[PDB]
Design an enzyme around this catalytic site. Structure first.
Site, PDB file in Angstrom:
ATOM      1  N   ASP A 168      11.529  -6.354  -0.926  1.00  0.00           N
ATOM      2  CA  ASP A 168      10.979  -5.558  -2.001  1.00  0.00           C
ATOM      3  C   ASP A 168      11.930  -4.486  -2.529  1.00  0.00           C
ATOM      4  O   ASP A 168      13.112  -4.470  -2.167  1.00  0.00           O
ATOM      5  CB  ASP A 168       9.548  -5.089  -1.755  1.00  0.00           C
ATOM      6  CG  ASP A 168       9.410  -3.904  -0.856  1.00  0.00           C
ATOM      7  OD1 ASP A 168      10.532  -3.535  -0.329  1.00  0.00           O
ATOM      8  OD2 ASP A 168       8.351  -3.338  -0.659  1.00  0.00           O
ATOM      9  N   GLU A 219       3.520  -6.794  -9.684  1.00  0.00           N
ATOM     10  CA  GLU A 219       4.180  -7.305  -8.500  1.00  0.00           C
ATOM     11  C   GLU A 219       4.953  -8.601  -8.679  1.00  0.00           C
ATOM     12  O   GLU A 219       5.810  -8.939  -7.873  1.00  0.00           O
ATOM     13  CB  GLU A 219       3.135  -7.481  -7.394  1.00  0.00           C
ATOM     14  CG  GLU A 219       2.417  -6.166  -7.138  1.00  0.00           C
ATOM     15  CD  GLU A 219       3.187  -5.153  -6.317  1.00  0.00           C
ATOM     16  OE1 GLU A 219       4.322  -5.590  -5.848  1.00  0.00           O
ATOM     17  OE2 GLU A 219       2.760  -4.048  -6.076  1.00  0.00           O
TER      18      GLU A 219
END
Ligand code: CL
Ligand code: CL
Length: 162
Positions: free
Chosen positions: A20, A11
């Site tokens: 994202d 991540e």
């Protein structure tokens, strides 16, 4: 290697609100803020999560607190889930981390949905599972990450991460 280190690699760490891979407002270590198209809505969710007026910016310590909460929630979600729990219990420690990773990224429901793969996981059919997992939107959208997770399930080792 462990789940925390594993997800931090996958991540990354961002201290400012960002979008994202899907275009959603996120912050820290993969902490989804909202699916809505509004930054303000994102800023509100963020202040509510942090407990202060952040102005879309957090510190490292705060990012880590979010992360601890999210890992804990993923694990708890698995254990409370009728379809997930038994798969989880059947796996070795490394493979459990791979399942947590998937849950963290796509939520309990999404994973709970991979019926065929869940069956292969339980049956310990490593190679077939790897093939099956690649036939997914998940693999097609984030292939490098999916590959790492898949190898993890296939081999039961941390090789893809070392
Ligand atoms: Cl939260
Ligand atoms: Cl990727």
């Amino acid at each position: 290697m462990n789940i925390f280190e594993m997800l931090r690699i996958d991540e990354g760490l961002r201290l400012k609100i960002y979008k994202d891979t899907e275009g959603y407002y996120t912050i820290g270590i993969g902490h989804l803020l909202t699916k809505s198209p509004s930054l303000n809505a994102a800023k509100s969710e963020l202040d509510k999560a942090i407990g202060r007026n952040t102005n879309g910016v957090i510190t490292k310590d705060e990012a880590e607190k979010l992360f601890n909460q999210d890992v804990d929630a993923a694990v708890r979600g698995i254990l409370r889930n009728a379809k997930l729990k038994p798969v989880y219990d059947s796996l070795d420690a490394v493979r459990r981390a791979a399942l947590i990773n998937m849950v963290f990224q796509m939520g309990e429901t999404g994973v709970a949905g991979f019926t065929n793969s869940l069956r292969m996981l339980q049956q310990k059919r490593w190679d077939e599972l790897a093939v099956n997992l690649a036939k997914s939107r998940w693999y097609n959208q984030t292939p490098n990450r999916a590959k790492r997770v898949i190898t993890t399930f296939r081999t039961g080792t941390w090789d893809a991460y070392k």
